[PDB]
Design a protein around this ligand. Sequence first.
Ligand code: CLA
Ligand code: CLA
Ligand SMILES: CC1=C(/C=C/C(C)=C/C=C/C(C)=C/C=C/C=C(C)/C=C/C=C(C)/C=C/C2=C(C)CCCC2(C)C)C(C)(C)CCC1
Ligand code: SF4
Lengths: 731, 40, 30, 63, 161, 91, 31, 80, 140
Amino acid sequence: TKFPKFSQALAQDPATRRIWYGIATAHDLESHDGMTEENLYQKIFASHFGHLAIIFLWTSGNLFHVAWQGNFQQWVLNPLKVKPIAHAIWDPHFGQSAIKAFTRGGVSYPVNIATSGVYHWWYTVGMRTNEDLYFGALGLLVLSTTLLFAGWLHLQPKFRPGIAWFKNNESRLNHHLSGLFGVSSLAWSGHLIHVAIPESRGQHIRWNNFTSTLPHPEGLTPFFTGNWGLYAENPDTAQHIFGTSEGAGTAILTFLGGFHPQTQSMWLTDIAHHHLAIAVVFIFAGHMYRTNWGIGHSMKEILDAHVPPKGRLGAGHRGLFETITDSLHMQLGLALASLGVATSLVAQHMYALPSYAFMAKDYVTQAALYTHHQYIAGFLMVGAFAHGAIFFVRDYDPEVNKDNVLARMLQHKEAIISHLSWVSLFLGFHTLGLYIHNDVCVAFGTPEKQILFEPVFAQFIQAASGKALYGFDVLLSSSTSAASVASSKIWLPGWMEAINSGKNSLFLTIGPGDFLVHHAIALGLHTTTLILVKGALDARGSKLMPDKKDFGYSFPCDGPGRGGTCDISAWDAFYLAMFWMLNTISWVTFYWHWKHLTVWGGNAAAFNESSTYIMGWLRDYLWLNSSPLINGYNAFGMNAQAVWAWMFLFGHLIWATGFMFLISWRGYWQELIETLVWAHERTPIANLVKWRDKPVALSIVQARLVGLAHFTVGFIFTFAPFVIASTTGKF
Amino acid sequence: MSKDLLKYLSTAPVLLTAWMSLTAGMIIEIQRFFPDSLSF
Amino acid sequence: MITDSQIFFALCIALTAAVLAIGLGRQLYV
Amino acid sequence: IERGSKVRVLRPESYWFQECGSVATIAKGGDRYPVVVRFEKVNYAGVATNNFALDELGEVEAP
Amino acid sequence: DVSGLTPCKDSAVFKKRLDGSVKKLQARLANYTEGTPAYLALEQQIDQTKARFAKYGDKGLLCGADGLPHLIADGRPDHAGEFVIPAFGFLYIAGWIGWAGRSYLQFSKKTDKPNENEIIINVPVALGMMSGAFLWPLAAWKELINGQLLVPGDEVTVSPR
Amino acid sequence: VDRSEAADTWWGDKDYPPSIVLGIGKDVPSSIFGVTSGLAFAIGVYCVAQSNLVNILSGSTVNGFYVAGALLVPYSWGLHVAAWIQKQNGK
Amino acid sequence: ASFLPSILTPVVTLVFPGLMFALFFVLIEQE
Amino acid sequence: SHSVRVYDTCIGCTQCVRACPCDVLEMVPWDGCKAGQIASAPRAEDCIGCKRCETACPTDFLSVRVYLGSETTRSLGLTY
Amino acid sequence: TSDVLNLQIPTPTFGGSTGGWLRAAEIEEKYAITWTSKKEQIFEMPTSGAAIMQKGENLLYLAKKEQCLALSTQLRTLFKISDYKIYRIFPNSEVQYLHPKDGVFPEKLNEGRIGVGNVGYSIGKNPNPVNVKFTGKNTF
Ligand code: CLA
Ligand code: CLA
Ligand SMILES: CC1=C(/C=C/C(C)=C/C=C/C(C)=C/C=C/C=C(C)/C=C/C=C(C)/C=C/C2=C(C)CCCC2(C)C)C(C)(C)CCC1
Ligand code: SF4
C-alpha cells in the first residue's frame, strides 16, 4: 500500500529514491509486480482512451479560448493585418507598463498573440464566428466525456476485452485502413465540399441548412451518371477573393494545382479531391486482410513465404509475425518511426505548400510550426530506436528468429556499426573541413578561395520538378518532354507558374551554403543513427559485456573492472543520441529560419553570401536577429517581447543546469548529503522535525535522465523564443 | 647517435612529429609555388 | 460574443468530464 | 585438444571467441574446463590465459 | 553555363570583387613609404591578388550571382578538374597510406615483439613498405585474388549476438 | 487469422514456393496464368498509352475503362510470377 | 465573463495544485 | 538486495572473497575445480554492489556475477 | 563462536568525531567490532580521525558492516591483528555474530560450508528475458 504498490521492491526501498523510481516506473506496465499479458493489454487500452480524451480536451480548450477571449471575428475581416489572439493574460505580477504593452490586437485587455496558426486553420476550414468555435469546443468536450466513460467501461469485468481480440491483427488493420483513414478522409472531403468551399465562396452553410443547400447546382446527378467532369467544370477564377462570391466558381473537385493567388494556399477544391481520392485508395486497401469471410490475406503466411531463393536473406521473414504480434515494443518502435517520418514530412510540406488561407504571409506561425514539427519528428525517431533497443533486450527470441532476416541484423551488426561510423566520420570530417576552409579564406580577406560546391543534383531535381532558372531544361522544365506534355491540362498550367514564381517557398533557390548545410544535416542524421543502431544491436551483449540482456535495458554500469563500463546499458545509447537529435534538428531549424528570414526580407544574397562560412551563421543569423529578442526589456523600458526575452534566458538557465547532472555524478552529492544529514540531525530545534525516507543522492540513471531533461527543455525554450520573437521584430 | 638514440628517434611520437613536419612543409611549399589552386 | 450562460454550460460539461476522469483514473489505479 | 597446439576458441562469451590460442596444459579429471589456453591478446581485465573445455576448442594447427 | 552560373572571366560581380580588393590594398598602402619592406610586400601581395583573379578567370570557373567561383561536381568532363582529378589523386594517396600501414602491420605481427614494434617503428623496413605501397592497386588486387586480404569472418572476434 | 490457423508457406529449404501461396488460384494452371498475364500486360499498356501517352489526360477526357485497365498491368506481374510458380510446382 | 479569470485562475493554480501536492505527499507517506 | 551468483567456471583462486568488503563471499569445498574450492554467496543481503569481486575475477568472463536489484539500507550503505 | 558480547570492554582512546552513527544506529541497527592488541598503539578510524587502541581488549562501535570490515582490513594488514570479531546490535539488544562466522576468515575453505548461489553452467548459458517474460523468476 506504500506508493509503489506495483513494485514491492521500491515499497521496501527506505530512501528517497523510492518516490523517484515509483513515479518513473509508473507507466512501465510490462515489468510491474503480478502483471499478466491480458491485464497489461487492458490497462494499455484504457490509458489510450484517457489519452485521446486529453487530446480532445486540449483541442476544445484552444477552441473555447479563441472563441471567448480571441479576436477571431475581427481577424476574419482583415486577416493580413489583425494579429490573432491566443488567450487573455491573468497575472497579478504585471505592472502598468507591461499592461499597456501586452494590451494589443484590438482588445482592451492584455493578450497573447497566437503563433499556432489555429486562426488560419479554422478560417480555411469554415469557421467565421465565435459561436461556431464555442460549439466545436462543446462538442469536443462531449467527445472527451464519452472517451473517459469508454475508458472506465473497458476495465469492467463483463466489458474487459480479451487477449485474442487484442492480437487480432487482420481485423484491426482492415478497420484502421478502411474506416479510420479511409472513411474519415471521405468525411473530411465531404466537409470541405459542403461547408468550406461554400464558405470560401460566400455561402453560410451550417447544421440548420446544410441539409437543404446543394453543394453543386447539378447535385448528385453527375456522380450517378458518371459525368464527373461536371464537378471540375467552372473552377475558381484567378481573380477570386477568399470569403466572397465575386470571382467564385461552382466546381467542387478540381486538380488545378499551384496556389490560390489571393491567399497563396492550395485550392480547397484540390484538397477536397485529394481527400476523396486518397480515401478511395485506403478503403480499398482496407479489404486486404482475412476477417471472418475467407477472402483476404494471412499476414503470417505472407511473412513465412517471403524468403528469397537459395537462402539469400537466411530464412527470410519467418518468425517476424510471431515476434511483432507478441512484442509490444516492436510495434511501438515501428509506430514511432513511421510517425516521426510523417511529422518530418508535414514539417517539410506545410511550408512549401501552404494549405491555410493567408498563412504564407504569417511568418511567425510558419517558423513556429516548422520548428515544432521537426523537433517532435526527432523525438519520435529517437523513441522508435529506443523501443527497438528495448525489444532487442527484452522481447527478442533467437529460437523463433533462427537464421531470420532480423537475426542477420545482429549477425552483421559489427559491419553495420563500423560502416555507420565510417560515413559519419567522412561526412563530419569533410563538412567541417570545407566550412573551416571557407571561414579562413573569408577571414584572410580573400573570399575567392572559398571551395563552393554547387548542389547540382538538388538543382537538377528542382529543374525536373519545374524550375527554370537553372537552365537544365530536363523533364518538366523542358516543355516538349513526355513528362511535361502528358500532364499539361490537369496541374502543370498552375504548378509551373507556382514553382517559377519567386514569391513562394516552393522549391527555394539553393546554393553552396545549401550544399554544405545539407551535408551537415546528413552528418547529424548518420551519427544519431549510429548511436541509436549501436545501442539497439549491442543491447543484448557486447565483447565487454556478453550478458547484458541479463541486466536488462537501463542499468547504471558493470563497475570499474575491465577498464570501466560507463554508459554501457543501451539506455545510455538513447541518452547520448538525444543530444545528437537535438543537434541535427537545431541545424535543420537554423537553416530553415535563416533562409526563410532572408527570403521573406527580400535579401537572399545574405544567405547565399554569408552561409558558406560559419561566422556568417554566427553573425547574420544569430547575432543580427537576436537584437529584437534581447531588447524585449532594457533599462529604458519594456516591449511585448519581454516575455520572449525572459523565456530565452529561462531556457538558457535550464540548458545550463542540465550540465550539472550531466557532468557531476553521484558520489560527490551522496557524501554532501551525508554532511547535510549530519547537520540536520545534530542541530537543535530542527532535529525534532525528521524525515521518513532517508535522503540520498540521485541514482546514476536518474541523474542522466534529469540532466538530459534540463538539456532538452532548455533547447526548446531558447529556440522557441528566438524563433518567435526575432521573426516578429523583423517583420 | 648510438643504437639506443636511433631507437628513440624511431619511437612513435618522434616519428609522427617528423613525418607530419615533412608533410606540412611539403604542403606549404606546394602552396608557395602553386598558390590559390581552387581547381585543377 | 460568447455569453455567460454559454460559458457556464460549457463549464458544467467540463465538470461532468472531470468526474468521469476521476472515475477512469480510479479504475486504472485498481 | 593437444598441448602445444593452436586452437580456435568457440565459447560465445569469450573475449577470444573465434580466435586462436596456444594450449599450455590439459588437466586430469576434475576440472570441467581442463584445457588451459594461453593467448597473446589481453582481454579487458588484462589476463592472457583462460581455462576451456575440449568442446569449446577447435584445433587449427597441431604441435 | 550550368545552374544559371556564368564564367568568371565574363562576370561583372567578379570584376568588381577584384577591383574592390585592389582598392582596399591600395588604400592601406598609404601608410608606408616607397621602397620600404612593407611597401614591397604589399606590392607583391597585390600582384598575387591580381594573378589569382586572372588565373580563376582563365581556368573556366563558373561564378554565381554572388561573384564567387562555384565548383560543379556532377561528373561532367568540362569541370573534371574541380573534383574528379583531385578525387583520383587523393584516392591514390590515401590508398598508398593505408597499404603502407597494413603491410607494415603484417610484417610486425610476425616479429618476436609485435607490441614493442608497434611503438618503436622499424624504420629501415617502414621506409621500404612506404616505397613499395606506390603500386598498391595491383598489390591489393593480388592479395584479394590470393585470398590473403579479407580474413574469413569465422576467424574474427564477434560479440555474443 | 490466428497463429494456429495459417498455412505452412515457408519455402527457404526448397527452390520454388508451394502453390498454396497463390490462395484462390492455387489450382489454375501455369498456361492460364501466363496467357492471362500476357493479355493483361498488353491490354493495360494499351489503356495507359491511350489515356496519358497517345492522348492528354484532362477533366473532360479521363476514361474509366482505361483507368481500370491500367490496374491489369500489376495484375499481369502477379500473374506471370504465378505462372512461373505453377510451372515449377508442376501444374 | 471577465469575472471568471479572477475566480478560476487562482483557484486552479494556487489552491488546487497545493491541495494535490498535499494529498500526494500524504498518500506516498502511508504505511 | 542484490543477487550474487557463482558459475562453475570458477578456478578457486580466492580473490573475490579477499576483494569483498562486506563478507558476502566465502570459499566452500567443490569437486569440479582443481583447487577443490568454489566461491559462494551465503550473505547476499549484505551486498552493496561495488563489484570488487567482478573486478578481481580473472576468468575470461566473470565466474562471480552480481545483479543489482531491490535496494535496502544495507545495500545503499547508509549510516543513517 | 557465539551470539553474545561483553558490552563492557575498554574502548580505544578517541577524542570524538562527527563521522559516527546519527539517530539511526540506535533505532535500526548498530555494529560493533572487538579485537585484541599486543601494544597500546595508534590507528586510523574508518570515520575520520586517529584513535589509540588500548593494550589487550578493544571494542569499537560503528554504523556500517562496510566500516567494520574496512577497520578489520586495516588491522590485519597494518598491525597483524587477526582475532577481530564483528557483531550487529539491534535496538532490542540482540547481538548477531557476523563476519568470522565459522571462526575462520572466509578466504580459507572449511569442510562444513555448503554452497549458496552456485550455478552449474557457464555464465553465457542463461535463459533469454523473453523466456521469463511475465514470470516471477529472473535470468540467473
Ligand atoms: C487543456 C486545455 C485548456 C487549457 C490549456 C486551458 C488554459 C487556460 N484556461 Mg481553460 N478551459 C478549457 C480548457 C483549457 N484551458 C475548457 C475546455 C474550458 C471549458 C469550456 C475552459 C474554461 C476556462 C475558463 C472559463 C477560464 C479558463 C482560463 C484558463 C487560463 C487559466 C487556467 C485556468 O484556471 O483554467 C482552467 C479552468 C477551468 C474551469 C478548468 C477547465 C478544465 C479543462 C478542460 C481540463 C483539461 C485537462 C487536460 C486535457 C489534461 C490534464 C492537465 C493536467 C492535470 C496535467 C488558461 C490560459 C481562465 C482565463 O481565461 O484566464 C485568462 C478562465 O477564466 N479556462
Ligand atoms: C594503419 C592504418 C590504418 C588503416 C589501414 C585503417 C583502415 C580502416 N580504418 Mg582506420 N584507424 C587507424 C589506422 C588505420 N585505419 C588509426 C590509427 C585509428 C585511430 C585514430 C583509426 C580509427 C578508425 C576508426 C574510428 C574507424 C576507422 C575505419 C577504418 C576503415 C575505413 C577507412 C577510413 O575511413 O579510415 C579512417 C581513418 C582515420 C580515422 C584516421 C587514420 C589515421 C592515419 C592518418 C593513418 C595511420 C597510418 C599509420 C601511421 C601508418 C604506419 C606505417 C608506417 C610505419 C610504414 C578501414 C578498415 C572506420 C571503419 O570501421 O570503417 C568500416 C572507422 O569507423 N579507423
Ligand atoms: C532498431 C529496431 C527497430 C527500429 C528501427 C527504426 C527506428 C527504423 C527507422 C527507419 C526509417 C526512419 C526508415 C525510413 C525509410 C524511408 C524510405 C525507405 C524512403 C523511401 C522513399 C522512396 C522510395 C521515394 C521515392 C520517390 C517517390 C515515390 C516520389 C518522388 C520521387 C522519389 C524517388 C523520392 C524496430 C522497431 C524495427 C525493431 C527491430 C530493431
Ligand atoms: S574466478 Fe572469481 S569467484 Fe572464481 S575463484 Fe577466481 S576470483 Fe573467486
